[PDB]
Design a protein around this nucleic acid. Structure first.
Lengths: 94, 94
DNA sequence: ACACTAAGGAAAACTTAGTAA
DNA sequence: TTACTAAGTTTTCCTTAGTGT
């Protein structure tokens, strides 16, 4: 998991490391420590948790694993497109 | 990491679980076991190994971590674009 | 060649109990 | 409050050594 994507998504959201964990379902006791470990690259969360974090952060989970700056932006933006906007890009791909 | 995504990518590369591990840097002696365990979802590779696996499979590492089928395709398809075709999309998104 | 699995040491994540701006 | 960390504990993985096609 890319620590910097985790930091940018959390900052845009406006919540602490501890808050993020609790909402993401991590136990109050270890929430603060764990969320800091992931954000400092000391440990990696597992994919389940990653999804849970993504859900709180209102981003697609794969943004967290996207190194390509240009692609990460596309994902972040695809996420917010409305019904027509996406239907446009779909015909585009196929 | 989504095992189904790993499997589909490998099959399109037209290579064995083993060869994949070998080319991805896993030692010959364990490459088969490991790559199978990943593909059956017994254990998940760490991100570094994911990245290695992706370079060999000629795909963006996000693909392995994207549960949405329509976003996965977008990622896969963006991958096939040239430097200019990508400037064309990056401006649409800025 | 190719897909696959149990077991147990190797290694990584999780928990606790904190400190530091 | 929020960020951060070491050390202990528990969990998951990598390697070995086989299975079967």
């Amino acid at each position: 998991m890319l620590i910097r994507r985790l930091k940018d998504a959390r900052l845009r959201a406006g919540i602490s490391q501890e808050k993020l964990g609790v909402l993401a379902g991590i136990d109050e006791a270890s929430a603060s420590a764990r969320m800091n470990q992931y954000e400092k690259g000391k440990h990696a969360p597992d994919f389940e948790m990653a999804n849970r974090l993504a859900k709180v952060l209102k981003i697609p989970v794969s943004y967290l694993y996207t190194p390509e700056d240009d692609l990460a932006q596309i994902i972040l933006t695809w996420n917010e497109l409305n019904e027509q906007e996406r239907k446009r890009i779909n015909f585009y791909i196929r």
